[PDB]
Design an enzyme around this catalytic site. Sequence first.
Site, PDB file in Angstrom:
ATOM      1  N   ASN A 357       0.818  -1.178   0.000  1.00 24.50           N
ATOM      2  CA  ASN A 357       0.000   0.000   0.000  1.00 24.50           C
ATOM      3  C   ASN A 357       0.867   1.248   0.000  1.00 24.50           C
ATOM      4  O   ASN A 357       1.833   1.326  -0.762  1.00 24.50           O
ATOM      5  CB  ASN A 357      -0.977  -0.091   1.144  1.00 24.50           C
ATOM      6  CG  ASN A 357      -1.889  -1.314   0.973  1.00 24.50           C
ATOM      7  OD1 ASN A 357      -2.284  -1.723  -0.143  1.00 24.50           O
ATOM      8  ND2 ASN A 357      -2.208  -1.910   2.073  1.00 24.50           N
ATOM      9  N   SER A 358       0.621   2.186   0.909  1.00 21.38           N
ATOM     10  CA  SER A 358       1.352   3.449   0.907  1.00 21.38           C
ATOM     11  C   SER A 358       2.803   3.309   1.264  1.00 21.38           C
ATOM     12  O   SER A 358       3.598   4.216   1.028  1.00 21.38           O
ATOM     13  CB  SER A 358       0.865   4.371   1.943  1.00 21.38           C
ATOM     14  OG  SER A 358       1.356   3.959   3.163  1.00 21.38           O
ATOM     15  N   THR A 359       3.203   2.184   1.828  1.00 26.40           N
ATOM     16  CA  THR A 359       4.581   2.069   2.234  1.00 26.40           C
ATOM     17  C   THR A 359       5.440   1.761   1.034  1.00 26.40           C
ATOM     18  O   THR A 359       6.662   1.848   1.060  1.00 26.40           O
ATOM     19  CB  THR A 359       4.748   1.081   3.384  1.00 26.40           C
ATOM     20  OG1 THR A 359       4.339  -0.261   3.022  1.00 26.40           O
ATOM     21  CG2 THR A 359       3.914   1.596   4.537  1.00 26.40           C
ATOM     22  N   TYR A 360       4.814   1.467  -0.088  1.00 23.75           N
ATOM     23  CA  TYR A 360       5.575   1.265  -1.288  1.00 23.75           C
ATOM     24  C   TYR A 360       6.193   2.564  -1.735  1.00 23.75           C
ATOM     25  O   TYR A 360       7.177   2.574  -2.477  1.00 23.75           O
ATOM     26  CB  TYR A 360       4.783   0.699  -2.404  1.00 23.75           C
ATOM     27  CG  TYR A 360       5.656   0.453  -3.554  1.00 23.75           C
ATOM     28  CD1 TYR A 360       6.579  -0.552  -3.509  1.00 23.75           C
ATOM     29  CD2 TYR A 360       5.551   1.247  -4.644  1.00 23.75           C
ATOM     30  CE1 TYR A 360       7.400  -0.761  -4.561  1.00 23.75           C
ATOM     31  CE2 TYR A 360       6.353   1.040  -5.701  1.00 23.75           C
ATOM     32  CZ  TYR A 360       7.278   0.041  -5.669  1.00 23.75           C
ATOM     33  OH  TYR A 360       8.055  -0.180  -6.757  1.00 23.75           O
ATOM     34  N   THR A 481       3.077   5.488   6.821  1.00 20.39           N
ATOM     35  CA  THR A 481       1.850   4.808   7.159  1.00 20.39           C
ATOM     36  C   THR A 481       0.820   4.829   6.039  1.00 20.39           C
ATOM     37  O   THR A 481       0.758   5.747   5.203  1.00 20.39           O
ATOM     38  CB  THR A 481       1.177   5.507   8.351  1.00 20.39           C
ATOM     39  OG1 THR A 481       0.950   6.848   7.975  1.00 20.39           O
ATOM     40  CG2 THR A 481       1.983   5.476   9.556  1.00 20.39           C
TER      41      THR A 481
END
Lengths: 539, 539
Positions: A357-360, A481
């Site tokens: 998700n956003s941690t990519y 996050t």
Amino acid sequence: MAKLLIMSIVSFCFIFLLLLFFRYILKRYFNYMLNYKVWYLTLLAGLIPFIPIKFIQEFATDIHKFNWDSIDNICTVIWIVLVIILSFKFLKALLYLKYLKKQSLYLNENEKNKIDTILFNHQYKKNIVIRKAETIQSPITFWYGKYIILIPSSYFKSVIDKRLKYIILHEYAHAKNRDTLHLIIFNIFSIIMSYNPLVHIVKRKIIHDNEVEADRFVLNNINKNEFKTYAESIMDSVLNVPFFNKNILSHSFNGKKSLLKRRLINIKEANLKKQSKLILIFICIFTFLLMVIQSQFLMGQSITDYNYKKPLHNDYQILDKSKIFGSNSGSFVMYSMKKDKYYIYNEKESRKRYSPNSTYKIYLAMFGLDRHIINDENSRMQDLNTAMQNSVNWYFERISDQIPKNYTATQLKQLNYGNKNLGSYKSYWMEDSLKISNLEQVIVFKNMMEQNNHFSKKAKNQLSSSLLIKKNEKYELYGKTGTGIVNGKYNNGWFVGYVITNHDKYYFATHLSDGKPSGKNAELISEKILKEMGVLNGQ
Amino acid sequence: MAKLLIMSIVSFCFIFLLLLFFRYILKRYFNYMLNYKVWYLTLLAGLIPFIPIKFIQEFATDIHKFNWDSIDNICTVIWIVLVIILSFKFLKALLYLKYLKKQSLYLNENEKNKIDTILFNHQYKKNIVIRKAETIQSPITFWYGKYIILIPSSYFKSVIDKRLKYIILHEYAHAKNRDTLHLIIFNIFSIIMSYNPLVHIVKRKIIHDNEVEADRFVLNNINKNEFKTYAESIMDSVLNVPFFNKNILSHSFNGKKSLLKRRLINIKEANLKKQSKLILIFICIFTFLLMVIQSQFLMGQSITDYNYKKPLHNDYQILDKSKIFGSNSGSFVMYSMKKDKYYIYNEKESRKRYSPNSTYKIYLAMFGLDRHIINDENSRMQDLNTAMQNSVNWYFERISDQIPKNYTATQLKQLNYGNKNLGSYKSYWMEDSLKISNLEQVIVFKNMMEQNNHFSKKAKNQLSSSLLIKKNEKYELYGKTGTGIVNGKYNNGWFVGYVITNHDKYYFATHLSDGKPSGKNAELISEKILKEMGVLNGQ
Ligand SMILES: [Zn+2]
Ligand SMILES: [Zn+2]
């Protein structure tokens, strides 16, 4: 729209089944038949739903819908084609019959006398026609609007056949019920409703019932003493000639294609021929190779969903932080660069791969930075710090679109980024194809900065800057996050990053699989653990 | 995952078809048979793919995916159940047979002498067993690992039957090929692969080929002069008894369920019974009512897609503005409140209903305003002016969620808002259920302010304020723009509103169906037309 045909099919099968139900019972317990005309009710049932009885800035959004219209376009054409083909087949038989009619002969006097001798006891409505033939091998009947009984001349030449009395009653019985009329009518309707195979099933079942009734009639007019004789004359019907079925629209006496009949034919046939072994040898060889060929492409199994099954190259410590996670079921992994040791909570959960998700965005930024999509002086597409910091997908989606997929893949592979699958979409990291476990992100993030020297130095720290959460006298906490949400439920909460402290360098990741697995919770959970573990205490 | 079964089905049918192809040809042109064992290749083909041969703010997004996993869960269970049922059926026959075995009798000397007289010319491998029975009506065979030929005692009592020689060769021939062995093996495999019906097709086809070969063998050992005699002895097999098929795992001599056989049975049976008319009368009545019942719910047709087919209550003028639209294919409608006349471009296109998209916000605001979701002093959920003005869906989606669906429906209906369908989602106006034509929006917007007096006065003008595009000495132009985009293509551009001028009150709408049908273009197009028409000139 084609769904309408589907609705019609359901109606059809409903009525169809009800009739079959009764048929079984009435015969099974009472030996009763049905007036087959009830089958017309099914054709009618089939057309129920078919009848339409109803008794200042611009805002825009990019939508996705299932296109089932192309399907109906195609289905429409298919329906049309099937009707065309069937029309021909119907015609084929029909034409044969009209030509056949023209070849018939009036019946003469003595034969007439014999026939009347047979049927005078019915005194029937003589509005039907009896003729003889020098062509056909066995008696047949058809409609034409004339009701014709046609008998080969050989059975009059057989002046003392006796059995004539039986064949005549049989033909009479079919004429009586106008079987040859209904068959045509029924078939026409069937031809149009080309989409529902149950119509063929009904078409066929009707024929058996017709023949059964004909037999009953005939027997009703026979001295029982001769029933045996009669039955013998029936068997004779399949001993002399092949059965024929060209005229699907008509009725013959030689019964039908069957196993018994094929065998009888085979007995007569001089079949004592042999074949070379090669016939089977080659069919078998090629069949095999063809299977081999199919195999070259065809394979699948649940094993392709495998997660991070792989052992570490170093030591790891199991840890329990369940009081911290509480209802937010998840996993936690930390790594000490100096000790070359991992610290793991829920080592089973920590191996499960989920979209990052956003941690990519962490890796996405590294890639964008190396490729000069974005850079350390100007990271604007929004910029890197802002987009990371304020959750802006517009920015990161643009970075992704501009990174050659092969560059991304090169680095996903060098770092062992989970399944390294970037799919095909600019947003491949969010509830999509690229997946990585919590344990893998710790491993991977660490390698990204510490082991992989392909990446520019500036990309490594430009990224860290965008990730700073907190700074103080003991450490600097970095990370990102976010949450994967599906159909409104938060299912994949992440917090990924690193902590550089006054004592060591740590890598970490927190993932939440259930409860309220938000990004914020992954962060709060990670912080509490990292503090307890000394990472965020400078211990 | 169940898709794997599908892959297996494809493999199966491929091989299956190839074999059928050859079978037809070899027989058709050369009268050749196949060693049926080739069918095992299909079972093998069926398992190809089956074998796994691989050789800092939080960011989150709410995703929708097709759930096909629940399907596989269910399919798995079904497969299991089918296997359980089939296992029983197999067992049922199997048990019968072992019990049957125990009732057999050794064959005595004179009979043995006759049998050897028949088979001494084969000098075969006497590792098979021949017995007699006081039970069964006709000879049968089965396996048990013993290879047993069992003949009713009546055929030894028939000491001069002669035909014994034929029945013996028949049985010998099946024993020779171990048909009873392969059948069991094959069936076991079939039982497991419960998901592919073609296996039953193969199961059945094999049997015919087996019997054919048996006949050939037998004929090969018969003086041709007696072939007729032989064939007669075959026919006799279906004249004395009903056929039986309980032991699906074994081979009988009376052939099989067939039309001919049913008829022969019916001849023997004292079937001369009658039935009351009521049997058909009631079945027909109920069948009818049931169709009636189905109808009470079932209906459909393309007519439900009807657009604004309805004529105006007043006069309208056709207009052409195609030089303005250019490639942006669309429609244009204007209405004069004082003249009670419409001015229409592309009167066909103007009647087509499309989701209103962002222009629904006009009506949404009226509804939110009357219900005190938002109001004229405080319209915040963002506020009305801002959200309209800056394209904020967050705000309008919240208004929608809070308007009782019945209130919205009440006003959509009072105003004739197209199909008045608000679906079920808070965002029902965007590429979704609620649809309205360009002509209808002009009619509807006009009624909203001029004819419908349910709406508060404040709601009417609070809305106009949020819509102001331009103001000057001749008029005030109000409206809203937006675009429905599907799979990245702009398909529905809108501009909807009104113009109050120094001479009249106008209502209008512009819709773009193709080219680059953006909201902005609908606005630019409308403005150019409205200016040309005098609406935006004060003429
Ligand atoms: Zn008949
Ligand atoms: Zn047999």
